[PDB]
């Protein structure tokens, strides 16, 4: 907004809840654009329905247009009709079918995951990359 209301800049871990709170959708298909019409594809990496329209103030089909329909979503394609520059601002999120570990907290020596769990870096690398089992509970 304004560089006077910029008192602090905090950095911290982003939990899965934060990641899916930033997101305006979920990229579910590994597609970018149409080969022939060269337009953003549905649910793809460049999806217009998630990150906004490629052209200022239009839905994907063309039903709603112009500033007069600002803040609306076409019911056919689902694109919100607003400025295209929001495509530089809105994020998505992929819902992993299985959990993964952030590499920065595993490989970066000292292995912070290892120090937290007291697992040797070799052991952590074996567990995480499915080379050796590990016991998580014992009655």
């Amino acid at each position: 907004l304004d560089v006077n209301f910029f008192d602090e800049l905090r950095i911290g871990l982003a939990t899965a809840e934060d990641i899916r709170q930033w997101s305006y959708g979920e990229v579910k298909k590994p597609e970018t654009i149409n080969y022939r019409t060269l337009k953003p594809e549905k649910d793809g990496l460049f999806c217009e329905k998630i990150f906004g329209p490629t052209r200022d103030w239009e839905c994907y089909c063309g039903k709603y247009k112009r500033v007069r329909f600002k803040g609306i979503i076409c019911e056919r394609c689902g694109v919100e009709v607003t400025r295209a520059k929001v495509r530089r601002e809105r994020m998505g999120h992929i819902e992993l079918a299985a959990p993964v570990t952030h590499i920065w907290y595993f490989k970066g020596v000292p292995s912070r995951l290892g120090y937290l769990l007291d697992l040797a870096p070799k052991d952590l690398e074996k567990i995480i990359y499915f080379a050796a089992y590990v016991i998580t509970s014992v009655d």
Binding site: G12, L13, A14, T15, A16, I19, R20, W22, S23, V27, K28, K29, P30, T32, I33, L38, P40, L45, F46, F51, K85, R87, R88, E89, R90, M91, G92, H93, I94, E95, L96, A97, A98, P99, V100, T101, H102, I103, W104, Y105, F106, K107, P110, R112, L113, Y115, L116, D118, E125, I128, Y129, F130
Partner: protein
Amino acid sequence: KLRALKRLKVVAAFQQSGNSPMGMVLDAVPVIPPELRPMVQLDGGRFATSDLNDLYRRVINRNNRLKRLIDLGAPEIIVNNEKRMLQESVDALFDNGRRGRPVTGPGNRPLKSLSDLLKGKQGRFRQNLLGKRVDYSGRSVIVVGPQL
């Protein structure tokens, strides 16, 4: 005591703050806005990817394939291999070449990952934030003027 002390520089951090130690393990991977990884129709129609859509495509392909393999019902060998591949894909997305050979693209060159954008003299912190190109500027050869 030395190993104990080093471990208390990471075990204290997750205590002093109300941060969970869970943020290390991901269930969702954020996807950067598309125009920060543009796909541009260069002159001649030849499209130019962003080198990050490839890593994201790999992640999404492997995630969807994992979903389908779990849905069908597959032996633990194949599903565990798929999970390892998904872990490697997310690793390559966040940092190429940190573990194993870097993921290479066409021409046998490493794929510019999501962390290479920040590190180095050609990274973002040093090539586009502290130093920038400016308008209203020119350059020319200098010649002595003693009458000035």
